[PDB]
Amino acid sequence: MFDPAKKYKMDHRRRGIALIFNHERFFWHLTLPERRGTCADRDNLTRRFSDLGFEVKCFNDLKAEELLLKIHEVSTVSHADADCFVCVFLSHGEGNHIYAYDAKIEIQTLTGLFKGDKCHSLVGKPKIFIIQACTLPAGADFLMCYSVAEGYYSHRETVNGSWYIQDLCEMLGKYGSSLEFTELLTLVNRKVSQRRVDDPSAIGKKQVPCFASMLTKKLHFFPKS
Amino acid sequence: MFDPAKKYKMDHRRRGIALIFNHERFFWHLTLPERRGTCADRDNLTRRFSDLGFEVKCFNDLKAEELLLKIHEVSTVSHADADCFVCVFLSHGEGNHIYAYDAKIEIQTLTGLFKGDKCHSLVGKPKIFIIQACTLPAGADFLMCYSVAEGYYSHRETVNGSWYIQDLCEMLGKYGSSLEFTELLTLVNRKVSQRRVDPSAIGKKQVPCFASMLTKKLHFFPKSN
Numbered sequence A: 001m002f003d004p005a006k007k008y009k010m011d012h013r014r015r016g017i018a019l020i021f022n023h024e025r026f027f028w029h030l031t032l033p034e035r036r037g038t039c040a041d042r043d044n045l046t047r048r049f050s051d052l053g054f055e056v057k058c059f060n061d062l063k064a065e066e067l068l069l070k071i072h073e074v075s076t077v078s079h080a081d082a083d084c085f086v087c088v089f090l091s092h093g094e095g096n097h098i099y100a101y102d103a104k105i106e107i108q109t110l111t112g113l114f115k116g117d118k119c120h121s122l123v124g125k126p127k128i129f130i131i132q133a134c135t136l137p138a139g140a141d142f143l144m145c146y147s148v149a150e151g152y153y154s155h156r157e158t159v160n161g162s163w164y165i166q167d168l169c170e171m172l173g174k175y176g177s178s179l180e181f182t183e184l185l186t187l188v189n190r191k192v193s194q195r196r197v198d199d200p201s202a203i204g205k206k207q208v209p210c211f212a213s214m215l216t217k218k219l220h221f222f223p224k225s
Numbered sequence B: 001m002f003d004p005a006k007k008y009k010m011d012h013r014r015r016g017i018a019l020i021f022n023h024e025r026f027f028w029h030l031t032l033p034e035r036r037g038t039c040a041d042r043d044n045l046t047r048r049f050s051d052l053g054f055e056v057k058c059f060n061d062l063k064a065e066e067l068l069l070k071i072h073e074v075s076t077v078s079h080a081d082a083d084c085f086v087c088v089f090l091s092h093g094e095g096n097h098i099y100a101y102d103a104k105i106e107i108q109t110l111t112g113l114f115k116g117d118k119c120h121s122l123v124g125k126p127k128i129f130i131i132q133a134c135t136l137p138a139g140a141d142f143l144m145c146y147s148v149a150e151g152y153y154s155h156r157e158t159v160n161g162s163w164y165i166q167d168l169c170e171m172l173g174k175y176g177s178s179l180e181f182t183e184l185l186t187l188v189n190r191k192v193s194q195r196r197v198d199p200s201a202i203g204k205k206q207v208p209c210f211a212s213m214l215t216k217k218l219h220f221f222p223k224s225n
Helices: A032-051 A064-076 A097-113 A163-175 A181-194 B032-051 B064-076 B097-113 B163-175 B181-194
Strands: A017-022 A055-060 A085-090 A127-131 A142-146 A210-213 B017-022 B055-060 B085-090 B127-131 B142-146 B209-212
Touching (some): A032 A055, A032 A163, A055 A064, A085 A097, A142 A181, A163 A181, A181 B181, A181 B209, A210 B181, B055 B064, B064 B097
Parallel strands (some): A017 A055, A085 A127, B017 B055, B017 B085, B085 B127, B127 B142
Antiparallel strands (some): A142 A210
16 A cells, blocks of 8 residues: 655666756856856766766757757657656856846756656656756656745855855765755755855845755665666 | 754644635635535644644635734734644635635735744744645745646545645644654655546646755654643
8 A cells, every 4th residue: 555655766777867057158257256166066066966876967058059969868868777867957146137037948948858748768757956046847756956945045156166056965975875865955955044154245144945846755866786 | 063864843832823724705606515625625634733733723715804803813923832833725726817816915925924034933943834726935944835736737626625635634644743744745745646537637637746945854743742
């Protein structure tokens, strides 16, 4: 009958793809912290998801030609022998209205490609989207992880990256292979929300992340094989 | 150090208020299964939250004068000796545009009254909103539970209530006092998504969702008598 401890099947051959998408186009004056922080976040993510068995692939949206080339690949490639799919969307904080509006269209596109109708090979498999906001995607077995609720405070980028990706990567490296994934995201909620400014204008305010789950089972990333 | 198993402090004198809000006004014609189903949902919820230690209150929005009265009561009353706050928002499925638009403002108002700035006595304590949709609430230590995604299928009310409330109450009764609450909501996601239809709803399934800004594990262990 009903098993409260039922888990997603994570014994397939591969873990799956971990797509790290960098939103760059329509962003012009890029300071030194932003440029070195974005690279720190990507590299930190590439190490934590690779250690969990994912095949990391990193795109950006600067070259429209290469963008469609590599997007078509991940959308049409078969995931039948994969445990799950992960997609991380990275963006800069201080962006214009064109940059911010493009991100929303990109996020809708990405999430839409992996819904049950357009990707049979991921049906019944967790589809995890981690979005660094500058939303309303939904679907069975989706997990949406947001760095901040839209309209609320998020700390500026730093040479070492952003608060959300730093804390998410610390928990992933420390607890990724043991704890249930939503328990892990709850720890990121606490770690990030506890950080404080040393920007005297941002005194007293905090960054509150959020995650929205449509998963039906427990999700673990025990070491494979 | 950092405790990955840290949980909210739930040893206060009282558990807290469990507000059951019935959205009724502007519904143009109420069929028999809808009258009883809504009553079945309210009674089922009152039984389960009472057994978990909550002080249950049930309002509706038929009397405009009496509602602002009671909304003022639950908002301004002290929660300093309470573990948390729960609010269930019940509404009918087949509603007109006025009925649906009114629901959004009611939900936006209700959640707003319990923000940290508006309610000092619930700061750092979980605030749980369970919404039977016909959204964008946020805040630290908020837990939003939706019967359905924003614009997807939801099964219609019956004499015994709605699929979402029935399955929620079944899990609360069996596992409410033991399992972490988000783990319990995940079981609801599976139970509701597995139910099939016996007309024009072939191949459809209702996929619930919950959005967490909680920072700790949430349990409802039996209170100290």
